[PDB]
């Protein structure tokens, strides 16, 4: 709280987290037998 002040790999990280959410939703669509 004291020393912090507000004032190229980020796009790949955004792509990876979007893919992670997509895969999480896809596997959460059914679950069940995959479990």
């Amino acid at each position: 709280a004291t020393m912090l002040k507000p004032i190229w790999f980020n796009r790949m990280f955004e792509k990876s987290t979007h893919h992670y959410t997509d895969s999480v939703g896809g596997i959460l669509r059914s679950t069940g037998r995959y479990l």
Binding site: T17, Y20, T21, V24, G25, L28
Partner: protein, 49 residues
């Protein structure tokens, strides 16, 4: 360690599942899957150590 990350995830989910009531499935996975930053950073640090 694995229990600690699991507890983090479930607590983060339940925090807005109960106190906010945002949703049950469609509204909790979206707000929880964005917490992959600390887990990945810590795993990377631990294996590299």
């Amino acid at each position: 360690l694995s229990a600690k990350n699991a507890i983090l995830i479930v607590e983060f989910a339940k925090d807005l599942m109960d106190k906010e009531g945002k949703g049950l499935i469609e509204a909790t996975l979206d707000a929880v899957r964005m917490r992959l930053r600390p887990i990945l950073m810590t795993s990377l640090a631990f294996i590299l150590g």
